[PDB]
Amino acid sequence: MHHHHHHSSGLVPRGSQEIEAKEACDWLRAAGFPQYAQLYEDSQFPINIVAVKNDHDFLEKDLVEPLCRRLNTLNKCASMK
Incomplete structure (x- = not known):
């Protein structure tokens, strides 16, 4: 295993946060925890x-x-904000 071995991962939050938000809350209810x-x-x-x-x-x-x-x-x- 050479030193050239790793797994990086960028990050792109600021964007879909909108659709993610409405879902996030609509998901908790579908997940089985509408209390959150x-x-x-x-x-x-x-x-x-x-x-x-x-x-x-x-x-x-x-x-x-x-x-x-x-x-x-x-x-x-x-x-x-």
Whole structure:
């Protein structure tokens, strides 16, 4: 394994954040946790995410990961700048 071995990944958030936002909240309900989204409308989205994914979200680990994506996504768009 030569030193020329790695896996980089760019980042393009600022853009689809719009469609991602509406989905993020509309996804939490489809994922099985409509309790979270309910916060979006309240704007209480930005908060200790990590402590949240643990707080309630405990069903399926594959459902915990994406949960950090939407929350982390809206948590930014929920700032209304």
